Amino acid sequence: MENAHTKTVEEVLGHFGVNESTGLSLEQVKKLKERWGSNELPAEEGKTLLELVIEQFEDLLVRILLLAACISFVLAWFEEGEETITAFVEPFVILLILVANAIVGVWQERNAENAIEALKEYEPEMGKVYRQDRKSVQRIKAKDIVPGDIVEIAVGDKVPADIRLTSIKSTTLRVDQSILTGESVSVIKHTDPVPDPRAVNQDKKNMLFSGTNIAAGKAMGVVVATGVNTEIGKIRDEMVATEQERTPLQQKLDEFGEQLSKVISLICIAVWIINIGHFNDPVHGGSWIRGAIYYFKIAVALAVAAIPEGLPAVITTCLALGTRRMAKKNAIVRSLPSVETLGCTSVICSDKTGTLTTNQMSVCRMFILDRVEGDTCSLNEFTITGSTYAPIGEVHKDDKPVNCHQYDGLVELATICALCNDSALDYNEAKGVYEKVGEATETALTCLVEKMNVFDTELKGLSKIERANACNSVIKQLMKKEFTLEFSRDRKSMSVYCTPNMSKMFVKGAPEGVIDRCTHIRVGSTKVPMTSGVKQKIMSVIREWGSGSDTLRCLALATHDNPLRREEMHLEDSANFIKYETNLTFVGCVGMLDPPRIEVASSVKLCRQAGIRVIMITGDNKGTAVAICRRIGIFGQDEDVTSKAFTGREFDELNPSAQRDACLNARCFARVEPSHKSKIVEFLQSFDEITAMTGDGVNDAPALKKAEIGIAMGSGTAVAKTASEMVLADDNFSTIVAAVEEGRAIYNNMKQFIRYLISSNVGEVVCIFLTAALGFPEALIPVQLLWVNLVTDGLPATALGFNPPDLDIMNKPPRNPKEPLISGWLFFRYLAIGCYVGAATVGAAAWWFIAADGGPRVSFYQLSHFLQCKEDNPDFEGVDCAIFESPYPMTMALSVLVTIEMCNALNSLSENQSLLRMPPWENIWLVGSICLSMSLHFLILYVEPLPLIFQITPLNVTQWLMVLKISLPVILMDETLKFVARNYSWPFVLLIMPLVIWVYSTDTNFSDMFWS
């Protein structure tokens, strides 16, 4: 069945072989059940943990980590000549972290689910259908409906499946379709076929799409689509079809990892070339066959030194902290890398209905006829501060609180609003909020009546359940209803006749018809005949409310004090309805709209300050979208919007060259399909701009998937929350601004500690390369490198993750996504730092070799040929040979590396500001982590079993002073580099004296002037 709206009810019923009066038989029900399937949308399949683990390998950082670990284990198996099993420890310690963060990668996701599925109303859709088994209607489950079923729908009932209308039992049928198309006002439905086959969902006025609900009437229909074949099913399929790429942070990390792998390959090739041809010496090896093992050991040590193992752990820690901060700020984050995406966001695309506005119609402005004379009059204007269905609020007359009990005309206005309508407002604790039960306008009138207590009813000690209708009931008892003249299309108004416990008849409708059908006006408590001037005045008020700066739905109200009695009523004719109120007393009019949320305008201003562009993409009409844009501040009140607001049809006809500056300039998009929303998001992404698509409902589900980051309102549909990466549980729109702020700060911290880790890794690489080239014995075994790069390089990195945010963070435009984390000059600076670190470590080892008070004196680089001396040959000196395996040089190099890393973390507090201007105690976490890691290093040195796992030994006072003497100049070098970067306090210096002056006490020539 296709294009059911284009076909009349007769052939639609004939196609399925179903009768409207009887329905479907059980055999037909089961045949259609097996032919089509279950009438439900399939849930997301449970991603097994094994698949998640195997797909976590896709990141290039963990890719290089895993390949390095695998090669290390392979060469651990290669080194079968050793006996102690502790060697096989050195690869294993890697694998643990490769799991740890991975678990967190799953764990947080699970937490997100625990916060996403919790914000769902798990009430099965319970649908009334007609079948041949029983004449009366029967209530069945949602999944039991099959195409061809006859469904009776009523007010307040959610539509179970796509239903073509057959006949409306009531007068008119109103359907709220804000879920599917973002329409802010209910749509009237009819059984007339729609000739256009390619009509949009809003053009189809003879269809009841799934997910929507009925507002006013009751109707009968025939199901034409179920499950996936429905409009929501097609939209969900389109959302699943679209592919979400990696986050910009993930892309930057992947590029960084590719560069790092290229560096590893280049350095390994270079060291192999510089080390090949060294087998010509009369040593063992079997033509480099047995020297290949030593060369590969050097290569794997270099690869380990070049890969920061603790980087993923600190990255995950920072992302988890940001996610926790959003959890505190009522924002659920699905994926850890997505918390930074808002920081680099340039354009924010937002839905109007339900996202920018509360989707709850409310009255904001009302006027009563105050003072009238011949041809001129003065009107009393009022303003309502309520934005939602909650009955809390105050009425303001010329910007001051006012009680409506003093105004009689306000009393009649409240009476008409409370009595003429037929809907109501209720409060529930499952969601803990207020909902409507009928038309949005009627419940808006009810909320307006409740807000203005004309009868001064007590409310300070009343429960929230009866708060929704606290004073509406008070109005109802005193003036009891008799009957209702329903709404008529030609009349554009509807009336209620009622009698007291005299006998007035209220009428509410469009301003023009109501004011044309009235022959009296109400001034306070007095009746005044027709005079023109008041008529033009009130008509001007009507159109300045309708088409002014704020677009409002004007609703004229009148009362007939002398209507015809009950007995002379003919309710069977709609034509007779109009003539029953030929003489009316116009009381007043009210203005209602779907108001934007109170936190939108300030958030829009803040986003404009941060350089972020805000665009409205909605399915509603252009006028309402432009009005909301003007209200929230996207456009000015008098600003022209000729080339800044577009419709889907207008955008389609636009040339791609015109579409270029349309996307770069236009800020309002109205009447767009979900495919059009995804097309707009893709076009914006085609200009290298990070897109934050915030919204709710089904119509935003594909776009939420297409954008770089998708944000879903907590009151939105389940599909929208599934397609999004962030969820606003409390529906606070400033949370987006807060998330952007922390994302910028988090990216700054990322840059800081990635640069610190790269400095440490290049230092280790230079140390190993210099040791290999110089021929000296190894100064750093790989397990020490793992211990350093995890503990001593994660605790300072975690502390750097707590860097204080910049003051000018939110007053600058978003960063260019194409820029790299490490610039050329910063790369040179950190390369120099690493070269100094490696030179310092090698120099400490050589200093222990050649000039040590408690060590040997094999100096002038003689006998430094490692793996060469075996006995007392002439090149062999007086000292022994086993001293080359002493752990003293190893622990000296380790201590120098640790101290230099402490200094590098100390002066990496700022990108360019000197450590003198910014004292290190600004970040107490930094000094805390430095002290903790130094304490752990001391514990490693002075504990029983670890100094055996690590080939180290405790030092003495002189060696420690030498270590600090070597380590401190890195602070001066970094300060000089920062100074030359900037150009091209007292309390800190006071603490410098007890340290640097102590260094001046002892001076040593170092006895090292042979080569370097």
Ligand code: BEF
């Ligand atoms: F729901 Be949006 F306003 F189209």
Ligand SMILES: [Mg+2]
């Ligand atoms: Mg919406």
